[model samples]
Target: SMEQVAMELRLTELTRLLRSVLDQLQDKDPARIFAQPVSLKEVPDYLDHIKHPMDFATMRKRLEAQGYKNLHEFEEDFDLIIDNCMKYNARDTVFYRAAVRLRDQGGVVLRQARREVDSIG
Candidate 1:
């Protein structure tokens, strides 16, 4: 019974941390540009550069669907989104700046959440 309870508690904390990280990232998005998938019509060449596209909407969908096996997998998506942005846009562009800023600012919440998850486990 204790083991079962422990598993349940760990899940709650993990879920909390994932939500915390995602929420912070989404909130810092300046124009809600990172809210969803990039439109092919507008940026048709996106796939040409970025092999794997990751977005907040996709993150939330996977999160709600129980697709992430661990917090590290969640972190994988976070890094991918930033990496995709930096790869596709010019260093001086708002898109690139936003990604960099999000990575720098959001890292606070992300690192704290990771630490909390590890402590809980």
Candidate 2:
């Protein structure tokens, strides 16, 4: 259903907005961005770096730490990842295995935030 697809796409946009609000609480700091978990924003870029599962695993950990609730969020947006993985799959069995492992584990992640104070310390 196009409507369902449209709804999903809208959900994607909503996810982006929620993510941006969270990002602001970090004072627009890039460091916080890295420390927090990955989302759609991270996926398009993350796919390019995969040479191994460990690499993907490392990313997963980072995202998890930032309270990213699911791996599918990353996976659903994995066209970039898939495209890049294809380029380097012949280089190592580990790479292919790792990439597949990530793909299988992927699902939508919700951003969970604790108390955020806009005031100074």
Candidate 3:
């Protein structure tokens, strides 16, 4: 149990650090910070090619049922989108840039949520 908790904590911290780096990179490229990939239109279909069709389907269903109601929900969906984009665009530099932008957007939402929680608490 301790090992599992440690692993989860490490993964959470790693994700936060990675997103911080991604946000910094995007900030340096203001104009293209949120650039869309050439294959953006095919994201849905691309999800099928990745090993996460089930995840994509579930994300889609949840989104369809009730759209993101808050920054937390938005960040969760955006993170999923960015994760799939990163996997699909790993080989292409331009596509990777696109994924980075997606990541940065999610990071922004996450940052806002953190600020809100901190202020409220």
Candidate 4:
């Protein structure tokens, strides 16, 4: 159970990291492109292309190099978290604050976007 909690925490951190990266990129216009559906299969390849990526690959490799073998066992952790977050918080508070670090911008659009993206995955 501790492993499960740890993996969930890891995913929570990753989700927040992605949201932060997107926040920085929002002014770039193209940042919204990532608002679309992201499949599990594409994540590793995407990280490979990043110049300074904070992706699961780095996490997986580091953990595996340390003799861990159950990385994929935690794959469903993100879905579980998004399920809970959407149940308790909206994009306006949890999602919006999570991404742009702004609590004032919480609204229907961002809230819907958060739910939609979670459903997409």
List model 3 lDDT by residue over 1-121, tens digit each.
9998876665555444434534553454455523333243755576466653223334344444444333355455556555665676565677468667656664565675567544643
lDDT of 1 by residue, 1-121 (tens): 9998887666766776687778887888868868888889999988988899999999998877656768889989988989999989899899999999888987888778878777867
**Could you tell me how far off, in angstroms, the CA of residue 53 lies in candidate 2 after the best superposition?**
17
Each model's TM-score, in the order given? 0.86, 0.28, 0.41, 0.26
TM-score of 2: 0.28
Off by over 4 Å in 4: 30-121
Model 3 compared with the native: what TM-score? 0.41
lDDT of 4 by residue, 1-121 (tens): 9999887766655455444433433333232322333343765554344333222334334443432222232223323223333433456773433434222232323455455446633
Assess the local accuracy of residue 33 in candidate 1 as a C-alpha lDDT between 0 and 100. Answer: 66
Give the poorly placed runs of model 2, Cα more than 4 Å off.
1-13, 16-77, 107-121
Let me know the TM-score candidate 4 reaches against the reference structure.
0.26
Using lDDT as the measure, the top candidate is 1
Pairs that clash in candidate 4? 92-106
Cα shift from native, residue 87, model 1 (Å)? 0.8
Report the Cα lDDT for candidate 1. Answer: 0.84
Q: Judging by TM-score, tell me the better candidate of 3 and 4.
A: 3
The predicted structure with the larger TM-score, 1 or 4, is 1
